mmCIF file of C-alpha atoms in Angstrom:
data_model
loop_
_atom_site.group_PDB
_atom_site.id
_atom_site.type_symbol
_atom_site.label_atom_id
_atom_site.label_comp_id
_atom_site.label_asym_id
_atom_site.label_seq_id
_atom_site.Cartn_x
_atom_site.Cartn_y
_atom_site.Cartn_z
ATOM 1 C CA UNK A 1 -26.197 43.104 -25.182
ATOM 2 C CA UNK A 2 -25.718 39.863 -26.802
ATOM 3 C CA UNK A 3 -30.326 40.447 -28.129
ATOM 4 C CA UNK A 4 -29.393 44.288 -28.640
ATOM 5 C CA UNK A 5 -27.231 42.787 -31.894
ATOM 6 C CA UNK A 6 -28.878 39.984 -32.931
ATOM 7 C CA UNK A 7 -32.051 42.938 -32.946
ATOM 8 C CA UNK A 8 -29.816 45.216 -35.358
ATOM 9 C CA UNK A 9 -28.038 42.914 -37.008
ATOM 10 C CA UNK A 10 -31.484 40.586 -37.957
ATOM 11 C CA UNK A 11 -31.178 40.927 -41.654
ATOM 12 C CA UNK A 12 -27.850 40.727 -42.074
ATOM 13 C CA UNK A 13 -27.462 37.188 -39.950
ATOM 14 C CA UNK A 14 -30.209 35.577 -41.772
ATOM 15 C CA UNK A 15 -28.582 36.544 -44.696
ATOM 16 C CA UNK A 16 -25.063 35.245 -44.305
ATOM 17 C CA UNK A 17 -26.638 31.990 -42.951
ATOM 18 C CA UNK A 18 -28.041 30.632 -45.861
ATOM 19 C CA UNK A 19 -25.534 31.011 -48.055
ATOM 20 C CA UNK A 20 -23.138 29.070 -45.502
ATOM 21 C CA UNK A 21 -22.414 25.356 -46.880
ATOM 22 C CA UNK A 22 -23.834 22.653 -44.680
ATOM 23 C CA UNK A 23 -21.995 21.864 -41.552
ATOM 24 C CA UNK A 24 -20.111 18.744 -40.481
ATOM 25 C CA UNK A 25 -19.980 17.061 -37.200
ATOM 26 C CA UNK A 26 -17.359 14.507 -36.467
ATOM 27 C CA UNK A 27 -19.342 11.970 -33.739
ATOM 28 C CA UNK A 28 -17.834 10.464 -31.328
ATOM 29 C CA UNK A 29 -18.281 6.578 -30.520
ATOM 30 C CA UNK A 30 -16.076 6.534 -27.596
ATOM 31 C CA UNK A 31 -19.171 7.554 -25.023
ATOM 32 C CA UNK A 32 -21.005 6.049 -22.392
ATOM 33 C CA UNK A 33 -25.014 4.466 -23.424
ATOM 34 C CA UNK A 34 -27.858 6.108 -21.342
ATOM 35 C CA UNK A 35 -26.734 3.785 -18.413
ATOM 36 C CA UNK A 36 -23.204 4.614 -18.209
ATOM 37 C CA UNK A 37 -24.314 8.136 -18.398
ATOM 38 C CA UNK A 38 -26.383 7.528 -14.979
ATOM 39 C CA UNK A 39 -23.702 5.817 -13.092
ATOM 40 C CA UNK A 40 -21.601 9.162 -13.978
ATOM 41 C CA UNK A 41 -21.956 10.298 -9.898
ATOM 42 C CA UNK A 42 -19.482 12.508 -8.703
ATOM 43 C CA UNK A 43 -17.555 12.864 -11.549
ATOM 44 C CA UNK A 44 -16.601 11.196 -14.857
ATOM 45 C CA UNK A 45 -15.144 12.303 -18.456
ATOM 46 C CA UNK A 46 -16.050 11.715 -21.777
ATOM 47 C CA UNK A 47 -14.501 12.955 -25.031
ATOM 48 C CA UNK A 48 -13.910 16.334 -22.972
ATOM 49 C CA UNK A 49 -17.208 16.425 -21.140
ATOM 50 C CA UNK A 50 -17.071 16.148 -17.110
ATOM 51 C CA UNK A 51 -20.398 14.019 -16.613
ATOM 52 C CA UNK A 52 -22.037 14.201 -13.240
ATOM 53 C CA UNK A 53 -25.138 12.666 -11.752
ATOM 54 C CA UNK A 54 -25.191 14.065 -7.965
ATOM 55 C CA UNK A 55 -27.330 12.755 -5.200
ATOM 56 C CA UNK A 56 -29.419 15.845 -4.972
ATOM 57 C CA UNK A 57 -30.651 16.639 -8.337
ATOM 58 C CA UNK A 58 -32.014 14.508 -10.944
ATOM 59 C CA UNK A 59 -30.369 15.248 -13.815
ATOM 60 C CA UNK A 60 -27.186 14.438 -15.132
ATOM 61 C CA UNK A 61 -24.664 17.284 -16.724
ATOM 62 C CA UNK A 62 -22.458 17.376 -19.392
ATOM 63 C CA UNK A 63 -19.983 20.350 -19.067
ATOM 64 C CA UNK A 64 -16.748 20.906 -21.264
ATOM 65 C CA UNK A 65 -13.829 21.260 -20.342
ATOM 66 C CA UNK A 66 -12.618 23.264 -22.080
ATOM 67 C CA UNK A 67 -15.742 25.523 -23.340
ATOM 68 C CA UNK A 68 -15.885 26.449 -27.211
ATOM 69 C CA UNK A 69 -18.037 29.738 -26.692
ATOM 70 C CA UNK A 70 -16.540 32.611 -25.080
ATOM 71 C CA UNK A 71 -19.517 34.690 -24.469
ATOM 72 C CA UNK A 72 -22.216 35.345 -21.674
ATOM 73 C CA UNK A 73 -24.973 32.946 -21.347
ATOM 74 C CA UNK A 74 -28.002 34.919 -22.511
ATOM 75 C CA UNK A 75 -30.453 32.947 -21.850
ATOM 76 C CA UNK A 76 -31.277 30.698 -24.956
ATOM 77 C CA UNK A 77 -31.395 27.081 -24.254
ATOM 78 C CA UNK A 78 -33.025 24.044 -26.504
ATOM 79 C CA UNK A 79 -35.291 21.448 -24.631
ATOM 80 C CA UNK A 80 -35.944 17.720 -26.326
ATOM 81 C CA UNK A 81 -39.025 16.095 -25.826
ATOM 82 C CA UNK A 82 -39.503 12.055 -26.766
ATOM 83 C CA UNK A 83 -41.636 9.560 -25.322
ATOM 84 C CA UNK A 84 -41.027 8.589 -21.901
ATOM 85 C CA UNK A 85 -39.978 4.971 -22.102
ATOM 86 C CA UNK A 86 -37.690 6.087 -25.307
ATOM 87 C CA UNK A 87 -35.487 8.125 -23.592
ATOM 88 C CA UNK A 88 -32.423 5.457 -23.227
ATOM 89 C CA UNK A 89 -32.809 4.863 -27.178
ATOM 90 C CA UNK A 90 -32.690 8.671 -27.323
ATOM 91 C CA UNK A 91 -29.816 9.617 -26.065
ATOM 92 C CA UNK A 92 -27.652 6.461 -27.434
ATOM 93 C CA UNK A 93 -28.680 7.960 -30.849
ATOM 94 C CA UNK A 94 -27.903 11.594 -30.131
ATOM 95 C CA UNK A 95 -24.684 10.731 -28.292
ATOM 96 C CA UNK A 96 -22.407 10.776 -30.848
ATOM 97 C CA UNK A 97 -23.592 14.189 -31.505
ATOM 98 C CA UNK A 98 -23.909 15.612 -27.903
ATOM 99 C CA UNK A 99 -20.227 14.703 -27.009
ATOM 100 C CA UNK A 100 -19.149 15.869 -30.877
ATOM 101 C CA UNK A 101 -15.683 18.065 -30.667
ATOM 102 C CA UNK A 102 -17.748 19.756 -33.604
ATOM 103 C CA UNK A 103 -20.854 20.426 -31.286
ATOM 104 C CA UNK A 104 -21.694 23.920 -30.834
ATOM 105 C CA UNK A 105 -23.283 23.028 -27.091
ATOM 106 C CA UNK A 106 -20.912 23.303 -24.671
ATOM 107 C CA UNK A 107 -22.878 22.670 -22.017
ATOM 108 C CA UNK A 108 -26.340 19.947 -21.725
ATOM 109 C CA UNK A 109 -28.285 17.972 -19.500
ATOM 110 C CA UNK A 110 -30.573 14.693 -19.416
ATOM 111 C CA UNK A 111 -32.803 13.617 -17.222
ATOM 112 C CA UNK A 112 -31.994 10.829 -14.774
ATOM 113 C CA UNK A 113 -35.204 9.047 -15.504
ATOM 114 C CA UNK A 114 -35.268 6.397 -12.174
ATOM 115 C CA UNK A 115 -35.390 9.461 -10.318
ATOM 116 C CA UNK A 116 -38.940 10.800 -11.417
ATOM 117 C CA UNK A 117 -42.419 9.707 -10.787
ATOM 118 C CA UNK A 118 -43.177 8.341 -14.396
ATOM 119 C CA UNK A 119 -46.616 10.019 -13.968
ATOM 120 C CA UNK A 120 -45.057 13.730 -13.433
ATOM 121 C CA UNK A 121 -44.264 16.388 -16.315
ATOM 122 C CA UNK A 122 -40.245 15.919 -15.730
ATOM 123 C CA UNK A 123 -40.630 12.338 -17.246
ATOM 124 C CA UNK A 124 -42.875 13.365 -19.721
ATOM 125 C CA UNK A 125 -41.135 15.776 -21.973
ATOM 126 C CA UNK A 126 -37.646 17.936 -21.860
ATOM 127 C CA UNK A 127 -35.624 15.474 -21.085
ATOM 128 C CA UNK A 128 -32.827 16.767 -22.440
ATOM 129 C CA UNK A 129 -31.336 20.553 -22.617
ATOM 130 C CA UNK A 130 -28.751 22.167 -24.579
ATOM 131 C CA UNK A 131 -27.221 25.525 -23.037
ATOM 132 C CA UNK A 132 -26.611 28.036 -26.268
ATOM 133 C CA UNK A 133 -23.940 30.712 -25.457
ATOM 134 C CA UNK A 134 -22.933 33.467 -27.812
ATOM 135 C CA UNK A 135 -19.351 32.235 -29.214
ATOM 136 C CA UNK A 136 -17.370 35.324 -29.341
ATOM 137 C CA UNK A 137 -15.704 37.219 -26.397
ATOM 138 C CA UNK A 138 -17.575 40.459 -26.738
ATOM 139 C CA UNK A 139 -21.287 37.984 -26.037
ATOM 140 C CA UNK A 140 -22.515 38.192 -29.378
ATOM 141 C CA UNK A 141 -23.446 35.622 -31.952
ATOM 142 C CA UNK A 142 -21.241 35.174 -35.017
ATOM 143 C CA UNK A 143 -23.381 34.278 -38.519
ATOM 144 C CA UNK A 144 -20.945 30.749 -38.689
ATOM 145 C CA UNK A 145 -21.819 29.975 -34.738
ATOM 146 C CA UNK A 146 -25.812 30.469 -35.498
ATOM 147 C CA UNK A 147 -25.545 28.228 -38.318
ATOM 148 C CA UNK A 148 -23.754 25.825 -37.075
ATOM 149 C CA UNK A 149 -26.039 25.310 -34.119
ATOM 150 C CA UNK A 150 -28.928 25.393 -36.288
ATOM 151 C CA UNK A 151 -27.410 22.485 -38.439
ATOM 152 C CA UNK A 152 -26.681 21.280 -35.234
ATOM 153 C CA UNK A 153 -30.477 21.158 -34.246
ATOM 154 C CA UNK A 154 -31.384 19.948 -37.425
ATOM 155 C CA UNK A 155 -29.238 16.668 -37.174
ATOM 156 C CA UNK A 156 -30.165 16.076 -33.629
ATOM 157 C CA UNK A 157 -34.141 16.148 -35.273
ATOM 158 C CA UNK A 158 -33.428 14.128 -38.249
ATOM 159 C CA UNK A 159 -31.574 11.519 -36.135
ATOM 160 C CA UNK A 160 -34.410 10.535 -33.674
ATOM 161 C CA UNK A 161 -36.651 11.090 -36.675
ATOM 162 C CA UNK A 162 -34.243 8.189 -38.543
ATOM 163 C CA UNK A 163 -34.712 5.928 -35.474
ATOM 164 C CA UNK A 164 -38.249 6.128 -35.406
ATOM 165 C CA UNK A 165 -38.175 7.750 -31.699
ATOM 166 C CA UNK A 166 -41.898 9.214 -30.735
ATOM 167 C CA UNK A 167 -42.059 12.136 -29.900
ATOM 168 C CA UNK A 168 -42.878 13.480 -26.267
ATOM 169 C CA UNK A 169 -44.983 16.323 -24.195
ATOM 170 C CA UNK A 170 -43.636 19.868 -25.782
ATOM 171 C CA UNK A 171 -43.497 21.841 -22.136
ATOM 172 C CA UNK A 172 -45.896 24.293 -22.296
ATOM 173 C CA UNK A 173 -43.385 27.657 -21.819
ATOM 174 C CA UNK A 174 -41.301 26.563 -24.675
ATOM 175 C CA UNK A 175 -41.930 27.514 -28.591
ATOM 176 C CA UNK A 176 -41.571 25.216 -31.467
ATOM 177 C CA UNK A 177 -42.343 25.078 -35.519
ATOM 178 C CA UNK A 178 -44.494 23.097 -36.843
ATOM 179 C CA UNK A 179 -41.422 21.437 -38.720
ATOM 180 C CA UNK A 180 -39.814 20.368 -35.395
ATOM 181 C CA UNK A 181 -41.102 17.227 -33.486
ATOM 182 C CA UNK A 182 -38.903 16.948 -30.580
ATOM 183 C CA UNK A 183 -36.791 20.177 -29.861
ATOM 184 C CA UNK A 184 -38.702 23.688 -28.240
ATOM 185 C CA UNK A 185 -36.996 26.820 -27.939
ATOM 186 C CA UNK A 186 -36.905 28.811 -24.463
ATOM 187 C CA UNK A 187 -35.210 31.941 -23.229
ATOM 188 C CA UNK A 188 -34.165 31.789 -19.267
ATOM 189 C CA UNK A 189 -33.865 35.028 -18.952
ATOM 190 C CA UNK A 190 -37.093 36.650 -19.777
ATOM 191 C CA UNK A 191 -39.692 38.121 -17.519
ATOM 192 C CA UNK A 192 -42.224 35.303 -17.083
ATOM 193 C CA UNK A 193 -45.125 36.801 -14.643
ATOM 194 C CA UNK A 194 -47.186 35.965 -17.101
ATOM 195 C CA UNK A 195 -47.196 32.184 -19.218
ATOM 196 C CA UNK A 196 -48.068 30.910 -22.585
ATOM 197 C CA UNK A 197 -49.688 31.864 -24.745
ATOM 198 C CA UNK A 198 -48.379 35.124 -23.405
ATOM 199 C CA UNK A 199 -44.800 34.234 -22.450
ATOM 200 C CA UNK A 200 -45.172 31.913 -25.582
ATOM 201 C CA UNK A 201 -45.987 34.870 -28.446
ATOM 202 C CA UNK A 202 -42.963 37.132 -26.863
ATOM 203 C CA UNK A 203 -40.866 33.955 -27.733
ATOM 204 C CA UNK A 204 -41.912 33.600 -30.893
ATOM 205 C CA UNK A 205 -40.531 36.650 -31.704
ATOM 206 C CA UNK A 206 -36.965 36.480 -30.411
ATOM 207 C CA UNK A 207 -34.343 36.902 -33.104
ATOM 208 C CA UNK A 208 -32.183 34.067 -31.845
ATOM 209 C CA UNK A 209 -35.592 31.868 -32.173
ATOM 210 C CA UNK A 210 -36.632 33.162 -35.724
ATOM 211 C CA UNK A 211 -32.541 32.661 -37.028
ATOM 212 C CA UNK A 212 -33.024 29.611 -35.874
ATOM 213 C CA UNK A 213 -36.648 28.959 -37.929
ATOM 214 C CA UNK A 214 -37.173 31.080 -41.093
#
C-alpha cells in the first residue's frame, strides 16, 4: 500500500526532500472571487477545474479535469481553518494557488458559508479541504510530489499569514504543528472508534504527516 512505502521508505523520502530546490507555482488570475465561486451551481470551469455548488450539500468542489496524480486516494487530506467572517478574503488570496496548473491538489473544497448556521462548527473552522493523492500509477508517493505539496502548504500558510487573515477553530480530529496557523492534517481512512487525543497521537505519527513536518 501507498503507507506500507512511505513506512519503508521514511528515511530515504525525508532525505531526498530537503535537498530538492524550492518549488514554483505559476497562479492563475483568470478565477472566479469567493462569490463567483458560490454561484458555480451545476456546473462551471475554471483554469481546468469543474466548480460545482449543488442544492444538496454545502460545499462547493473543485475537481480537475484532467487529474495530475495517478494514484489511489489514501486517505490524506489538508483542512484550513480562518476566522469565520474572513473566509471570502481567504479564498480570493489562496485562489491563485488553488486553481495553479502547478498545484499538486487535484481535487478541493470550500465551504458555502450562507448555507451554515454561523454559530455551528462547519462555519467555524475547515473551511476549506485539499484531497492529497499519491502521484504515481502504482499509489505511491514520489520524493518530488511530497515536496512539492509541502511547498505547496507552505505558500498557502505564508499567504493568509501575508494578508493578515486570523486564524480559525483547528477541528478537533485533525493534527497540526505548532508552526502552522491555519492548515491541520487528517487521514480519512483510519479507524476512528476512538477520538483525539487518541485518534489525534496515531496521527501524529503518520509518515505522510511527519514528511510533511520535520
Amino acid at each position: 500500500s501507498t503507507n506500507k512505502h512511505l513506512k519503508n521508505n521514511f528515511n530515504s523520502l525525508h532525505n531526498q526532500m530537503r535537498k530538492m530546490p524550492v518549488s514554483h507555482f505559476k497562479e492563475a488570475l483568470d478565477v472566479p472571487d469567493y462569490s463567483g465561486m458560490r454561484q458555480s451551481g451545476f456546473f462551471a470551469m475554471s483554469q481546468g477545474f469543474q466548480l460545482n455548488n449543488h442544492g444538496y450539500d454545502v460545499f462547493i468542489h473543485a475537481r480537475r479535469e484532467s487529474p495530475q496524480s495517478q494514484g489511489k486516494f489514501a486517505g490524506d487530506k489538508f483542512n484550513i481553518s480562518v476566522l469565520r467572517d474572513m473566509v471570502p478574503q481567504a479564498f480570493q488570496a489562496l485562489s491563485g494557488l488553488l486553481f495553479s496548473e502547478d498545484s499538486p491538489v487535484d481535487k478541493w473544497k470550500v465551504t458555502d458559508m450562507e448555507k451554515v448556521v454561523q454559530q455551528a462548527r462547519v462555519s467555524l473552522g475547515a473551511q476549506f479541504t485539499l484531497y492529497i493523492k499519491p502521484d504515481q500509477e502504482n499509489s505511491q508517493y514520489s520524493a518530488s510530489f511530497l515536496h512539492k505539496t509541502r511547498q505547496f502548504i507552505e505558500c498557502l500558510e505564508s499567504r493568509l499569514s501575508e494578508n493578515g487573515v486570523i486564524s480559525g477553530q483547528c477541528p478537533e480530529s485533525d493534527v497540526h504543528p505548532e508552526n502552522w496557523k491555519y492548515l491541520s492534517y487528517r487521514n480519512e481512512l483510519r479507524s476512528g472508534r476512538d477520538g483525539g487525543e487518541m485518534q489525534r497521537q496515531a496521527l501524529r505519527e503518520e509518515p505522510f504527516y511527519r514528511l510533511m513536518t520535520e
